[PDB]
Structure formats: structure tokens, C-alpha cells
Amino acid sequence: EIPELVPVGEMPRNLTMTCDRYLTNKVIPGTRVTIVGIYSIYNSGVAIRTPYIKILGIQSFTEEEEEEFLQLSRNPKLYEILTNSIAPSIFGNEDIKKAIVCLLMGGSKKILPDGMRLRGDINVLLLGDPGTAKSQLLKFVEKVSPIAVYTSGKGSSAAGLTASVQRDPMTREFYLEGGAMVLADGGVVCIDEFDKMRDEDRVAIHEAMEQQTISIAKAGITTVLNSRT
């Protein structure tokens, strides 16, 4: 399930699904989908059978809401109203508010004629004195960004942040598994104490920041996975 819909203190429930023939290889890890399928179980505790889904069909606003948001676009003070709306509990700080607003929208994607892609994400570093509500600014973004992941520098790892390869005990096969920086694909991630994380985690971030990709080379397999984070 979506981590945004998961209240704190809970790990999102994971469910195994199977697809065959033309429905295979449509979705990679980190892709948000809508599922139509059959709920069932199969043996693989005392009698704890592992649930699984036979996939039948996967897909991946109100008219008045469109007019409501179009009216919001037509507001003469739209930019300043939204600027004030970002963390209204805090005072002043208009410039940092406005940059974070730019973070929410992000840039527009462009593709070179040679096939390369320009990174559209806007990444901002807060580098000031302690006690300036800089931690609170990240927390508010987590509650406004539809796709939001918040993690600390200390309690994170390159395998935890980026992708990893692990064996699924349900089907006894090695699966490619995404991480925190993979879940936040197509959204915004809030990392705190960025200075406190190790260089290897930073190095993996460099590929994500400047190429929107994560390259995995573990055990005896190599792969590259995109991450528009």
C-alpha cells in the first residue's frame, strides 16, 4: 500500500501477486498501479498460508474540482497566497518558503535529441544555524507532497535508500527490491542530517541526483534502475 496512506508506527502491508502472458513486465518496482484481481491463498506458522493474487487487469478529478482549481489558478494573488500557505505557523522566511514551493512543482522534463534526459527535480540544501525551523520545513513538505518519504541521515543506508537485491522466501527466488529513494520516485523525499550519512550513501545519491538512475551490482548480477526523486 501507499506509505502516505499508512499511519506512523506501521510498516505498509506487502502482498504477493502473479501475472502471466501479456500482463507480464508492464510494471517495474516503484510503480504505482491500480489492481483488478482475484484474492486467494496458497500453501508455502501452524497452517499459515501465504495470500496471493491472480492478476486480471492493472491500470497505471471532479468537474467542479477542476473549476475550483482553475479558479485558484485565476486568483490574482495565487503565488503569494500559496507562499503564505506553506507552513503558516512560522513567521517571515518568505524566500525559503518560495523555493520550497518551487520544489513542490518541480521543473519540466526535456529530452535531448541524443536520447539523454535532463533531471527535472529541484534539490535544495538547508545549511544554516540550528534552531531556525529548518527541520520543521521538511516535515511540512511531507504532509503536502502526495508522494512523500521522510528519513534521517543516521538511520539510513545505501541499500535502504537505493535499490537492493534480496531473495523472496515465498517463491524461493532472488528479487530486485527498491529502497526509500526508489519509493519516492515521482515525488519528493525529505532527508535530514544529510551531512551525517556516509559517503557511499552520498555517492549513490549522486547518480540519482544527476542521472535519475540507480545502478545495482551485488552478488553476481548487475542492473540499472531509474529514480526520478
Partner DNA sequence: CGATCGATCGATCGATCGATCGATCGATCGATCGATCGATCG
Binding-site residue set: 128-135
Please tell me the distance from the alpha carbon of residue 103 to that of residue 75, in angstroms, as a whole number.
21
Report what 130 binds from ligand ADP, DNA, none; CB cut-off 5-8 Å by kind.
Answer: ligand ADP
**Residue 147 interacts with ligand ADP (CB under 6 A)?**
no
Sheet with strand 16-18: strands edge to edge: 16-18, 50-59, 34-42
**Residue 83 interacts with ligand ADP (CB under 6 A)?**
no
Q: Pick the closer one to DNA by CB: 129 or 199.
A: 199
- Counted residue by residue, the chain has a size of 229
**Residue 169 interacts with DNA (CB under 7 A)?**
yes
Please tell me the distance from the alpha carbon of residue 173 to that of residue 43, in angstroms, as a whole number.
16
Q: Pick the closer one to ligand ADP by CB: 151 or 162.
A: 151
Please tell me the distance from the alpha carbon of residue 228 to that of residue 202, in angstroms, as a whole number.
16
Residue 173 CB, nearest distance to DNA (Å)?
7
Please tell me the distance from the alpha carbon of residue 40 to that of residue 48, in angstroms, as a whole number.
13
Q: Pick the closer one to ligand ADP by CB: 45 or 131.
A: 131
The strand pairing partners of 122, in sequence order, are: none
Report what 57 binds from DNA, ligand ADP, none; CB cut-off 5-8 Å by kind.
Answer: none
